[model samples]
Target: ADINGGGATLPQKLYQTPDVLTAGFAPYIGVGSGKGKAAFLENKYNQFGTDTTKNVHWAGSDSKLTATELSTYASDKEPTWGKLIQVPSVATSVAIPFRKAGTNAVDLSVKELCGVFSGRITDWSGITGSGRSGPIQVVYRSESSGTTELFTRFLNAKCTTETGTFAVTTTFANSYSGGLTPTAGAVAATGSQGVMTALNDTTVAEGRITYMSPDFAAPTLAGLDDATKVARVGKGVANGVAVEGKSPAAANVSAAISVVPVPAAADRTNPDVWVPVFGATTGAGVVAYPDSGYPILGFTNLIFSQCYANATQTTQVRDFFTKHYGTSNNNDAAIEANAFVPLPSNWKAAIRASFLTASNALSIGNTNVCNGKGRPQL
Candidate 1:
């Protein structure tokens, strides 16, 4: 029984490993978060790309589940699909990878990042101490993507110095309230793969950058070279002196993941409880990684049905979920190698107790409490 799960390119590599594939899931396809949500919500697998003949079992999304999406599920497919169970598979960094012609390290202050993305800064010369010179090329995702959503949230919370305002959204081209396109030298690309390809184009002159998953930006992980350099982002100050800018390295990103508070008991009833809330920055002048760890970070989520028509498939879902969060599983090594933060042990226990344990409200089973409340196998 191949449980076909797809969506969110951010963690596509993690989900594609043999451990997961052999555990009963099909190789995860990254059709972007919005499309994944549509497929899961509509029960149409074609939205997952190149597959038009099957029903979708589960989906992956980097965006937090919204009230609208939940309400839609209640109205559309609740009775047939059973209760929805959404949990973050892992926390990941949205790396800023660039193409440039120098050995000088590229470290950006939050304001500079705001300037560069908003078209306020058009050249490398515009940034202080950048030690480079050329036009700034901003390669952005043309498709609606959760990467765009996470990156723009940072801009909305911290890009106060810029002339325009950014709205937290999945559409990069129309995300700006000041009516901006990826301005100043912005180029459009379709997916995570497309944006990286555009950023690393050899014929193009230097100073190109794009927001993407650390897995896509890391050289060895993607079997690429130093042609694309990932930038380090400023995290404000340490004591009185300026702090070192943080990179999207696994260790650095793992630091920010700790700052996220545990969810309240009542919050667990909904999917959004698993997402980190990067609330607005206070005191006005502090403009970087508002939570005081890494500059840009977000979680990638897995969407599943609490029950399934086939008891065998429901058990397979349980096994896969265990391997996903278990430390002994090969997924841990692959996750760190791709620069994702694994859920802490306590976090894993909490999840199991709530959604993986048999007979729970959102557990994987076609018997006991789950009887008759499941998605039909059809």
Candidate 2:
């Protein structure tokens, strides 16, 4: 019952682990989206009373905390209050569902996606490769979601067509929401599953698209490998080099990780360092996904605190990571089957060292909290 927030597909991999369940650490993760989960962690870091009482051990988020939220709670440089641990668990990919009879693979670019989601490209005829010329129905997450954040962040940062129309901010009011006056042709779905449902329904008509993780999209359809249902996304060019588009394959997603910067020791304190690493933001007029595959991807972070109330909880956190995370044999098979990439060797070591530091300093009867305060450090 410890895991308390964020409802991304990654948590199930951890929650279903025999080690976690047998050890009585079963996480009752619910549907509080990535932004909401960050809020919970922020509240606990600030010692907002109830968060302390419940002992919300950690939270999961597809996206890291926003700049404003991070500054409010984790102000210190190398702050030990909260640390974002990158999980090798599932990486998110956009699943563009089209009619079963329609051409299976539509080669999509960031520009085309920007136009579709921004209501700029109203019909499928505008998308060059897509032959079906029906109205392009855009399905998006109505709720504030990490899925939306990952998809929108890439578009806002890289695609010129989406510039000014949308950017990466977590609040619902700031994002594209559904009401009577929602963005035209933008169908608002409540969650990933809802998006899957809405997109599946639109398949009857021929032209419909939505961003979803493989985990959610897979179960809803007879098979995820069916080419006609999902489209291949192109990574346009980096510095005029022809970077090829990639299909939604495990190898492709794994290759895309090369473009993402590794989190450093200092990033443990800064949320800004953590959020933008997924998609490329460096190139001009295009997002760089030099790696060949579906470019839009997400890596969920295990948001943990450096200081805890007691040794039991601290050791629990340490043991959990040491045993279940990274290249650990304990969870390799589970992680692979779930469409996740494993943590790099050095990154795993860094996390272990940090956990060790926290466990040693915050052991029972220790006076030193993360900030050397008498109160709970997180």
Candidate 3:
């Protein structure tokens, strides 16, 4: 028997712990989060990249759980999985990694970033002080994903007046102006492996830029150890000087998310306490993207069912959850080593007190909460 799980290539590195796998948990698949959503919600275990590995005891995602997704669950599998428990897995920043000739370091002002990703600026010449004079070849996610959501959300918020068409969506192509097709010279790669392949494309013209999690960019412990390949993003002007920008490194991600307002205690079990709105106030309870750190950063979440049919599998899930939240388990270590930020201590405590605690309100499950509510076996 296995505690099956998959989804969210954004956190694939974090999920594949030896400890996690050794405990009868199946290997985590690196499919994009969209497939994860479908796999868990639509009962399409085949969507997890293996038709044989059937069942989604838990899944992962960088995208916020939408009302539509929950509605789908209520209409379909609510009787099976019981209550869905979503929580922030970690805080991470989306890095703008690129390839360009004659650059000691790569950094972009907000105007420049907005223009490049939005296709308003097609050539490096469009950016001031960007040495090379060549065509810019943009690379973006081809699949539906939370990465697209995070990156495009940044553009949707900041690039409104600048150019192109950017709106909130998991598919990046949908955000591109006119139609889903990308700007003429841009390339589309599906999932993380495709992203790595496209980003590492040596045959491509110089000045290739794509958005990615800094961790997947080499542990960029590409360790780019100096981070010259990963571009720094502008944080706008501070005091009398124009601040160049911030990277998706840990400190900057922490700085950006630290300002996120604490959700009301009653709302802890809701998405208001989980998903973060970046940059603009597009909707209710939106928070500003930090001018103090990496401007484009937010939390990546893990999804768990409130109950499991088997007692052994249920215990494993609870223990795994405890190890993840505990002091020195490998899960959190891999989190930092992978360039992602751990949830703040106060927030970790809140999750423990709210969802992880033994209670009937909506948690990982206890006898009172999970009795007879175990999900249907896949």
Q: Per-residue alpha-carbon lDDT of model 1 for 1-378, expressed as tens digits? A: 567778788778777766754466777888888888887878877787665566788999987677898999977777766778888788877788888777666777788888888888889887666678889988888887988888988888878876679988889888777665444768899878888888888996877888988888865644222323777788356678777676767666676666556566667877667656453653221223544556687778888888788777887888877777665753677777777888777677778878877656656773665767777554
| Regions more than 4 Å wrong, model 1 | 50-52, 181-183, 221-228, 235-239, 281-291
Q: Which rank order by TM-score, best down to worst?
A: 3, 1, 2
Backbone collision tally, model 3: 3
Instruction: List the lowest-lDDT window of 10 residues for candidate 3.
Output: 219-228
Error of 1 at 330 (Å): 5.6
Check candidate 1 and list the clashing pairs.
none
Per-residue lDDT for 1-378 in model 2, tens only?
343333454345444545543243535454535534644554442221334445445566676665565555555522644333334334455555554346535667778776766667777677665666767677767666776666776665556644345657543336533222244456676766677778778436656677776656565333455556766677467778866456565556766654455456554444444433444545321335444566677666665555554545555555667665445456656555655555555555555554454454422223364444211322
Listed per candidate, the RMSD to the true structure in angstroms reads: 3.3, 5.4, 2.3
Measured against the true structure, the TM-scores of the candidates, in listed sequence, are 0.92, 0.76, 0.92
Candidate 3 residue-wise lDDT at 123: 84
Please give the CA lDDT of all the candidate structures. 0.75, 0.54, 0.74
- Encode model 3's per-residue lDDT on 52-85: one tens digit a residue: 7467777888887788998777667667567777
Candidate 3 deviant stretches above 4 angstroms: 20-22, 51-53, 180-184, 222-227, 282-285, 327-330
User: Alpha-carbon error at 325 in model 2, in Å?
Assistant: 2.7
Q: Please count the clashing residue pairs in each candidate, in the order shown.
A: 0, 1, 3
Q: Choose 2 or 3, whichever is better by TM-score.
A: 3
